Design an enzyme around this catalytic site. Structure first.
Site, PDB file in Angstrom:
ATOM      1  N   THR A   1       0.853  -1.171   0.000  1.00 61.85           N
ATOM      2  CA  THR A   1       0.000   0.000   0.000  1.00 61.85           C
ATOM      3  C   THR A   1       0.903   1.239   0.000  1.00 61.85           C
ATOM      4  O   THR A   1       2.122   1.114  -0.105  1.00 61.85           O
ATOM      5  CB  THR A   1      -0.985   0.011   1.194  1.00 61.85           C
TER       6      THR A   1
ATOM      7  N   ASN B   1      -7.005  -2.349  -8.833  1.00 64.08           N
ATOM      8  CA  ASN B   1      -6.952  -0.917  -8.538  1.00 64.08           C
ATOM      9  C   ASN B   1      -5.877  -0.106  -9.255  1.00 64.08           C
ATOM     10  O   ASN B   1      -5.992   1.119  -9.348  1.00 64.08           O
ATOM     11  CB  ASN B   1      -6.759  -0.691  -7.027  1.00 64.08           C
TER      12      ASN B   1
ATOM     13  N   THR C   1     -26.976 -15.329 -36.891  1.00 61.10           N
ATOM     14  CA  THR C   1     -27.731 -14.634 -35.854  1.00 61.10           C
ATOM     15  C   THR C   1     -29.046 -14.174 -36.467  1.00 61.10           C
ATOM     16  O   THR C   1     -29.062 -13.609 -37.558  1.00 61.10           O
ATOM     17  CB  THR C   1     -26.997 -13.374 -35.331  1.00 61.10           C
TER      18      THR C   1
ATOM     19  N   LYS D   1     -32.271 -11.877 -37.090  1.00 59.95           N
ATOM     20  CA  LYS D   1     -32.489 -10.429 -37.103  1.00 59.95           C
ATOM     21  C   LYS D   1     -33.959 -10.155 -37.445  1.00 59.95           C
ATOM     22  O   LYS D   1     -34.624 -10.991 -38.060  1.00 59.95           O
ATOM     23  CB  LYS D   1     -31.589  -9.755 -38.146  1.00 59.95           C
TER      24      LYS D   1
ATOM     25  N   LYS E   1     -28.724 -18.629 -33.900  1.00 64.68           N
ATOM     26  CA  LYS E   1     -28.541 -18.202 -32.514  1.00 64.68           C
ATOM     27  C   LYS E   1     -29.328 -16.979 -32.124  1.00 64.68           C
ATOM     28  O   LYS E   1     -29.736 -16.173 -32.974  1.00 64.68           O
ATOM     29  CB  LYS E   1     -27.050 -17.867 -32.257  1.00 64.68           C
TER      30      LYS E   1
ATOM     31  N   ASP F   1     -29.668 -13.343 -30.602  1.00 62.67           N
ATOM     32  CA  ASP F   1     -28.729 -12.236 -30.652  1.00 62.67           C
ATOM     33  C   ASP F   1     -28.279 -12.093 -29.192  1.00 62.67           C
ATOM     34  O   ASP F   1     -29.002 -12.510 -28.286  1.00 62.67           O
ATOM     35  CB  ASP F   1     -29.411 -10.958 -31.135  1.00 62.67           C
ATOM     36  N   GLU F   2     -27.102 -11.517 -28.953  1.00 62.46           N
ATOM     37  CA  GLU F   2     -26.597 -11.388 -27.589  1.00 62.46           C
ATOM     38  C   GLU F   2     -27.523 -10.690 -26.598  1.00 62.46           C
ATOM     39  O   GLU F   2     -27.496 -11.014 -25.408  1.00 62.46           O
ATOM     40  CB  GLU F   2     -25.225 -10.696 -27.569  1.00 62.46           C
TER      41      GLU F   2
ATOM     42  N   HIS G   1     -20.348 -15.485 -26.026  1.00 62.93           N
ATOM     43  CA  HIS G   1     -20.388 -14.222 -26.758  1.00 62.93           C
ATOM     44  C   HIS G   1     -19.582 -13.223 -25.925  1.00 62.93           C
ATOM     45  O   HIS G   1     -19.705 -13.186 -24.699  1.00 62.93           O
ATOM     46  CB  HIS G   1     -21.838 -13.754 -26.921  1.00 62.93           C
ATOM     47  N   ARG G   2     -18.758 -12.416 -26.584  1.00 67.29           N
ATOM     48  CA  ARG G   2     -17.912 -11.463 -25.873  1.00 67.29           C
ATOM     49  C   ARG G   2     -18.450 -10.039 -25.777  1.00 67.29           C
ATOM     50  O   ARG G   2     -17.676  -9.087 -25.748  1.00 67.29           O
ATOM     51  CB  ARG G   2     -16.520 -11.440 -26.512  1.00 67.29           C
TER      52      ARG G   2
ATOM     53  N   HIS H   1     -16.176 -15.748 -29.718  1.00 69.30           N
ATOM     54  CA  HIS H   1     -15.984 -14.903 -30.884  1.00 69.30           C
ATOM     55  C   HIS H   1     -14.547 -14.413 -30.906  1.00 69.30           C
ATOM     56  O   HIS H   1     -13.980 -14.071 -29.869  1.00 69.30           O
ATOM     57  CB  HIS H   1     -16.974 -13.736 -30.870  1.00 69.30           C
TER      58      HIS H   1
ATOM     59  N   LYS I   1     -17.282  -5.885 -40.232  1.00 70.47           N
ATOM     60  CA  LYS I   1     -17.641  -4.549 -39.762  1.00 70.47           C
ATOM     61  C   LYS I   1     -16.987  -4.142 -38.443  1.00 70.47           C
ATOM     62  O   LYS I   1     -16.978  -2.961 -38.096  1.00 70.47           O
ATOM     63  CB  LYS I   1     -19.169  -4.430 -39.622  1.00 70.47           C
TER      64      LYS I   1
ATOM     65  N   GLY J   1     -20.815  -8.628 -40.103  1.00 70.15           N
ATOM     66  CA  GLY J   1     -20.644  -7.930 -41.367  1.00 70.15           C
ATOM     67  C   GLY J   1     -19.911  -8.666 -42.470  1.00 70.15           C
ATOM     68  O   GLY J   1     -19.270  -8.041 -43.321  1.00 70.15           O
TER      69      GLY J   1
ATOM     70  N   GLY K   1     -26.968 -10.993 -41.072  1.00 71.98           N
ATOM     71  CA  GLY K   1     -27.515 -10.221 -42.172  1.00 71.98           C
ATOM     72  C   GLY K   1     -27.141 -10.888 -43.485  1.00 71.98           C
ATOM     73  O   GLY K   1     -27.850 -10.759 -44.482  1.00 71.98           O
TER      74      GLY K   1
END
Ligand code: CAP
Ligand code: CAP
Ligand code: CAP
Ligand code: MG
Ligand code: MG
Ligand code: MG
Ligand code: MG
Lengths: 464, 123, 464, 119, 123, 118, 227
Positions: A54, A112, A162, A164, A190, A192-193, A283-284, A316, A323, A370, A393
């Site tokens: 410390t 910290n 994924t 959509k 899957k 979507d997150e 999933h990240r 992932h 993208k 993407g 997509g």
């Protein structure tokens, strides 16, 4: 003498003559000190406040043997190309960590020190996890080999998608989209997150309808199918409740957002999946909040190693060409760290330490975001067979619908695999290979026409 | 190097580590609570001056937190002399009790002030 | 017509004429676009990929009503003093979120947008959480009022202390240090954030010895005492196991590292503490990895609001004057967001939206890290009575030991409280007030002598 | 008995005044957990009506103030105090906190007076 | 405004908040019991004059509720003098005990009368 | 039928329930309440206790004293219906807590036409 | 200042200038006061005794902020053609209610006020439930959309049927009646409201036989059935 008062950290925490032990956890920090702060003191401060010390001298140090427990900055190296920036290497004794807890490991190392006034910025680049500590974790519930064996899939990357729009679809329409996607040749679809449980679609209704669709597509095609059912929830109890129903339905895989959900909850799910035969897709979500900038945060390779320890069958890894940001060399670096049993130090790929895994199963990297049919050759060349390529997509955006969209991706993939196997150069002949396939596949031809001019080329922030 | 005493070193929360309050210092604390528009109230205890555990042991449960209310909270009081007067009245009727002065914040419904104003013989 | 193909995000996600609803979640993003990317397109991309859209047109949008679900960038403002940086405001419909799940809320808002190639950097500055959503959370297990009532402590900030060295002490020596610290006048002591369960000291042995010490100090002083027992663990099961034993011991408080442990596990613990009468201290380990830099990440005020929803009775807020970074105005800003029921928009303090809490209990801010007796006047002036001031090295670093170290801090604090109550100016008379007390308190005099010249003054990174 | 008949169009109004419950049906119920005799025996109270009191204001008091009010009422001679009917668990006062403080309060009052108390 | 005392204020249930019963007031209570055809009985206690909890703390359990019976219930008693006679006898043998008079209703098997008739010096 | 009881009802030893009288009652009602309900009842005073000028404890004392005064008078053979007021006033002579309560609510009565009639 | 004694409810609970909050629970009461009781007082009494007040002044009010907790009659309008009848509007702060509990909501709003001597009659006509309170409830387990999707039924009203006689049928005869009903085109059949478990037919036997019957009807018709 117990001498009250403040002393420089380097008096106790900077030991350049230290020879690391094979049981020590080693860390490589990118340190940017405030003007006037010597790199030795900055590195020592980081080592001290992340292990045993410390800001002032405490008498209790004399009750124990600090030489045996203290973190130590044993090496400092100036960073070329930057100003007043150094790579400081810190060693941490094995005794400082709780067995099997990634949560505890990070609490010490990044707890910290990133907020110290004496530093302008700080970034954790890499960690050398000793094999003695690696053995205290379960690791992936299954791993690459077992997954391929359970699903009976070999010789090519796996294909996912994924659904959509991200949010807004009802449970029945979700299953409707899932069935059409899977029957076309994709191995997985899957949630979507951010699809957990909401007013427009509650989780149990979704799980129920997706299982109906999933089983219908499997019967129709004769190939084993899966849909990552999202178990991510607000509490441990809710997360378990969802995993339990998936187990009841007899489906093969579930997913979890490990960073937004948290390491503690993720480790719990990892153990449950091991005991109940469920594959676990990770999933990240939120990772870029932490690993995008070069000067501050934690590089993804560190978050990747943490996941392999806590547990996950997929994770992932980026696409490089999609993208979302991701440099080629750096990506190949942590992909090896995720799949192999041994990776040697290689600064050209951002690998600061040689890492051994003593047979901890490998994790399948997932390329998503993407990407479309024209990227297939490059994706296959970069990742190889052991990967999962996902087109959200890129499937639901096809002019003829989900099934034809799935066919286009499956055909594009196999065309690349066949060409590669025959000895053709995917990097040089990629475009011609795709064109050749459009001659006999109208589904692929329709897809190529739509995304022909679409590329994502921007300067990268995260560079070695 | 001084060793902190262990015998007869009981404390009474806020302000008990400072030297005993003089008559003027006490008055200043009362003025502080009145200037903040908090409602003054006196409490006294003769049997258990310190917390203990007799009826339960679960988390957050302790006996001895509740003391006895002297009359009623002095709603509308704006004169510190009125508070000091009740203190003397309470002391006269209960010379053997610990007497506490508290101040209520009726909007947050939390006591914003609390300190012992009188201690019996031997404390 | 379902028209396959790629369209700009702003065509659907940039709605400057939109009037926000009182049920919408509003977000203020600090956006730094790549050269050539218009702010309207960058803001629209963020809104789209964090709510309902993807990179290309999907036919499934037609199955639902996107106008009712889409996130919308409704306002853009240039940032003065920076180049090519804008504050983009995004509105999210209430339906997009799972009730009572902070995990779900962040997965959408900060899930994938921070990694977009089209952006150089992105930072989430603030969130307007609608009261309709606030009511779906339990909030703090107890809150300021209830805590003070349970502990019977009023009229002054509470006093705490972290045991040192961080790691390396045995269970018995830990209890030994705890007893001496508490008997001197401190209200609480605590496990360091990385103290969970390790070879040198297992958790159950620690809990057992600390309870003995804690109860001995309470009997000796006559004031209620507590020691934050760390429940942070690698799994939900282990975390619960530790909380359960604390309940058995009948102690008043436990602690959790909410970011390294995770929101899912934290919410579970929060609910358990509510049902079992345990106060919950929250440590923000790892926060600086996310909130230090102005250009990228998430500001702490956002992490603070998230904690008040998930649940915690205390949370570290910084010291301003200590060893860790923290600007005064910005700190006062999120301290109000943590304690009050209503906080109006105030750009001078980094508060972008007016926030109402509909009676969700307030959280006690904890000032800790590199502070000592000379900082007492300033700490008291900045935070007021409703706060917890912690002195780890500031107690165990005292030349006469733990008890005298505790006395020095307790005396310094009460001297300030008395002076303030009498009408003295802590900001102007601070130093003289401390000096006056050293005349009758040898414990305080010894402390003042040791840290007289110690200050932490460096340029701040996080500025409004 | 009162399921659908009160809404019949053929009726202007309907009221159930009394019910003769046969002993054979009465025996299928547990009835009061204790009853008058057992209650007086458990509390050791005889020869007079028992005395209670509902804390006020109905809503708005904190858990600690509730227990404060309870102790003062019970110590004065009342056998019981009680939560108002609408006092369950709310923002201004959660149930577990109220239960805990009321227990401390009633046990203090019982020890002070020597008579059994309840809330 | 008067403050209700906290010290040495133990009560004894029914009739204990009224001024001490005079000789005739006591006799009238006994007449009341006898006129209702309830059977009288005396009980005395020397050590635990008030309820406590030593052996268990579950709902409804308290120690000190049972006292010792003086001889037997006076079945068929119709003369109040007979009852007041036993009271004096009991006081003679147990001047250090609390003594209460109870009245049994055998039909409901409920004590319809119960009041302290004698208290040891100091109470 | 004069009390609205249409059928003879038997309970085959099912335990009895204690009736609880509560709602806008105060010390001057004690005689009437004791007369109507008898010993087996619970009389509750909310505002009638926390509304006492000296606070809760004195408010409770006033009610306990008023009640025991009625019980004693009844047991001695006095008519609670005819002597109610006198019995309460007699007790105010030695109980200042009761006196203070009687002063506050002496004129308070609730008399309105009933809807639920036989 | 604490002053003991009774005051009219309207002095504290009648607030015609109050503007309602979007988080308030609003109630519309049809009030019929006794002769001689002003509508303002009657309205105020309902608001008071269904929120924070009682019949006399209590000192404890000063320990909290009654202004933020009290229910309040903010508007009164006469009822057309009715003698001495009014519609009184009362607002209740969000803080008075337990999250997700209809039981608690009714306990306050209709708990004791319908029995007041000062009123001849009272009827709760409507309630404005604020969205902030609505979100504390789960609501329907499924709802219209999900139900139609689960049963695969669209484009028309659904058809049901209560089995008769209400009581008296055996478990097997019940299933017999159910199969015949469902096979003819009805989507559902149902237990009468008073059919629980009785001597003539115990619940488990009924459930068992009705399951056999509904599955037979479903297989015969090709349409999803339920009981
Ligand atoms: O939400 C999305 O954007 C995706 O579903 C992809 O959609 P598309 O297939 O329609 O692009 C994925 O979660 C991202 O790939 C995650 O990023 P990463 O893989 O970098 O973690
Ligand atoms: O590990 C430490 O450094 C501390 O125990 C303080 O020790 P000292 O009291 O010896 O400085 C605290 O955890 C920090 O205050 C956390 O930072 P923050 O409050 O900013 O979250
Ligand atoms: O809320 C109230 O009004 C009370 O607490 C009484 O308060 P006071 O003692 O202040 O009047 C009671 O619940 C009523 O007696 C219920 O009515 P009933 O007994 O008719 O069901
Ligand atoms: Mg996604
Ligand atoms: Mg710490
Ligand atoms: Mg009530
Ligand atoms: Mg029916």
């Amino acid at each position: 003498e117990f001498k009250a008062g403040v002393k420089d950290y380097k008096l106790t925490y900077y030991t350049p003559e230290y020879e690391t032990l094979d049981t020590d956890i080693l860390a490589a920090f990118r340190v940017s000190p405030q003007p006037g702060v010597p790199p030795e003191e900055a590195g020592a401060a980081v080592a001290a406040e992340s292990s045993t010390g410390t800001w002032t001298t405490v008498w209790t140090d004399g009750l124990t043997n600090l030489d045996r427990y203290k973190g130590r900055c044993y090496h400092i190296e100036p960073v070329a190309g930057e100003e007043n920036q150094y790579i400081c290497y810190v060693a941490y004794p094995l005794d400082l960590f709780e067995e099997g807890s990634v949560t505890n490991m990070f609490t010490s190392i990044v707890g910290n020190v990133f907020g110290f006034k004496a530093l302008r910025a700080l970034r954790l680049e890499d960690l050398r996890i000793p094999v003695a500590y690696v053995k205290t974790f379960q690791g992936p519930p299954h791993g690459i080999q077992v997954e391929r064996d359970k699903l009976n899939k070999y010789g090519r990357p796996l294909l996912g998608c994924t659904i959509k729009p991200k949010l807004g679809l009802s449970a029945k329409n979700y299953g409707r989209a899932v069935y059409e996607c899977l029957r076309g040749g994709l191995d997985f679809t899957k949630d979507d997150e951010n699809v957990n449980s909401q007013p427009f679609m509650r989780w149990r209704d979704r799980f129920l309808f997706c299982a109906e669709a999933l089983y219908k597509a499997q019967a129709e095609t004769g190939e084993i199918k899966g849909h990552y059912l999202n178990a991510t929830a607000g509490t441990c109890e809710d997360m378990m409740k969802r995993a339990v129903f998936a187990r009841e339905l007899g489906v093969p895989i579930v997913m979890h957002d490990y960073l937004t959900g948290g390491f503690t909850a993720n480790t719990t799910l990892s153990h449950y999946c091991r005991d109940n035969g469920l594959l676990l897709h990770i999933h990240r979500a939120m990772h870029a909040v932490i690993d995008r900038q070069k000067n501050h945060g934690m590089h993804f390779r560190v978050l990747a190693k943490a996941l392999r320890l806590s547990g996950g069958d997929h994770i992932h890894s980026g696409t490089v060409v999609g993208k979302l940001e991701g440099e080629r060399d750096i990506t190949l670096g942590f992909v090896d760290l995720l799949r192999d049993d041994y990776t040697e130090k290689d600064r050209s790929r951002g690998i600061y330490f040689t890492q051994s895994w003593v047979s901890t199963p490998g994790v399948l990297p997932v390329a998503s975001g993407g990407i479309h049919v024209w990227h297939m050759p490059a994706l296959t060349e970069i990742f190889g067979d052991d990967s999962v390529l996902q087109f959200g997509g890129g499937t639901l955006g096809h002019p003829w619908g989900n099934a034809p969209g799935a066919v286009a991706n499956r055909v594009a993939l196999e065309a690349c695999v066949q060409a590669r196997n025959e000895g053709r150069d995917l990097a040089r002949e990629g475009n011609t290979i795709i064109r050749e396939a459009t001659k006999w596949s109208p589904e692929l031809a329709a897809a190529c026409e739509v995304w022909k001019e679409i590329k994502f080329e921007f300067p990268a922030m995260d560079t070695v | 190097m001084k060793v902190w005493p262990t015998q007869n070193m009981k404390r009474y929360e806020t302000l008990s580590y400072l030297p005993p309050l003089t008559t003027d210092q006490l008055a200043r604390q009362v003025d502080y609570l009145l200037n903040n528009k908090w409602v003054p109230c006196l409490e006294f205890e003769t049997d258990h001056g310190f917390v203990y555990r007799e009826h339960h042991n679960s988390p957050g449960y302790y006996d001895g937190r509740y003391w006895t209310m002297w009359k009623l909270p002095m709603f509308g009081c704006t004169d510190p002399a009125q508070v000091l007067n009740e203190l003397e009245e309470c002391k006269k009727e209960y010379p053997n009790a610990f007497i506490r002065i508290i101040g209520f914040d009726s909007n947050r419904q939390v006591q914003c002030v609390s300190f012992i104003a009188y201690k019996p013989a031997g404390y």
